[PDB]
């Protein structure tokens, strides 16, 4: 480690402020971003009745565990128990599976009416659900009424993630030998953007005790994995990658595209929470170096070696936001201020592809203003 993280100091860097933005403009911008996403201006969050709500993937017309778990994380960071509970309530009602091989997990995609489009889960959903739930327990207390017994729900979910398939036909979400998160439970490859060692550090404190060593090991395995998965010159990570670190392009996910964008963001947040490292600063410096001579209107899909496709980035605003959030891992970096300034000058996205960009956008607003916090017991 290179700095002491917010986990130890309990002080979160306001990078916007350190980079010269006013406290009042920062506060305004964070709130505006929240309101444009969750307020009643068509927006990614939709209230339903007195007790339900969801985040809608405006592009695919579905509700994803990625968005629901994001929404819960967002709501707890913002101290909005009412929104948290609406979303978690819908998730438990419509997504949680009690039948089939993936019982104990959440169906990754549902229609807006709650109908499951698949009984397969998406591990990046599970890990955000668990952490958001631990934060909710810590901010608000566990409810007496299920499923609002947050910390128990979190421990029980992480039990399944690690141990599924011991007493039967299910699959764990992490490989037990290499401690790496999987793309989906029935495969033996991974997805670099799913790797959240800063989350696993907290799981090592709060999960069932029987798994606390495993989670500390997973955190360390994830850090090592990211070293091999990001290209050594450009810093770009593939969307999917084998355990050996190389891209899995069997179905076209072996390049730098939408999934990959979260790698830079995850690295920035881990640096802020658990401390900088030389590897992380150098990695962000490489990503930002690669995009320094590129205009946002021209962002493409790239091979991880930097070779451009004709195809444009489908989510260039999300790319901007994650690259900016990555600056938390290289606050003195040569491109860190340009990236934060570019994000500052990029509005929240409109149109039917806005959901993914805007989730990344709010996470970056929170993190860069010192508002993406660890909530302790
Ligand atoms: Ni203002």
From Swiss-Prot:
Record's keyword terms, sorted: Carbohydrate metabolism, Glycosidase, Hydrolase, Polysaccharide degradation, Xylan degradation
Catalyzed chemical reaction(s): Hydrolysis of (1->4)-beta-D-xylose residues from the reducing end of oligosaccharides
BP-aspect Gene Ontology terms: xylan catabolic process
UniProt KW Hydrolase keyword: yes
Influence of pH: Optimum pH is 6.2-7.3. Stable between pH 5.0 and 9.8 for 30 minutes at 30 degrees Celsius.
Stored InterPro entries: 6-hairpin_glycosidase_sf (IPR008928), 6hp_glycosidase-like_sf (IPR012341), Glyco_hydro_8 (IPR002037)
Enzyme Commission designation: 3.2.1.156
Temperature dependence: Optimum temperature is 50 degrees Celsius. Stable up to 40 degrees Celsius.
Group of enzyme by EC: hydrolase
GO molecular function: oligosaccharide reducing-end xylanase activity
Record-annotated active site: 66 (proton donor), 259 (proton acceptor)
Pfam families: Glyco_hydro_8
Effect of residue 124 to A: Activity is 0.4% of wild type
Annotated SUPFAM superfamilies: Six-hairpin glycosidases
Superkingdom in the source lineage: Bacteria
Effect of residue 194 to F: Has high levels of glycosynthase activity. Reduced hydrolase activity
TM regions (residue ranges): none
Physiological role: Hydrolyzes xylooligosaccharides with a degree of polymerization of greater than or equal to 3, releasing xylose from the reducing end. Only hydrolyzes the beta anomers of xylooligosaccharides, with inversion of anomeric configuration. Hydrolyzes the glucose and xylose-based trisaccharides where xylose is located at the -1 subsite, GXX, XXG and GXG. Does not hydrolyze xylan, chitosan, lichenan, curdlan or carboxymethylcellulose.
Sequence similarity: Belongs to the glycosyl hydrolase 8 (cellulase D) family.
Protein name as catalogued: Reducing end xylose-releasing exo-oligoxylanase
The organism of origin for this protein: Halalkalibacterium halodurans (strain ATCC BAA-125 / DSM 18197 / FERM 7344 / JCM 9153 / C-125)
Source organism phylogeny: Bacteria, Bacillati, Bacillota, Bacilli, Bacillales
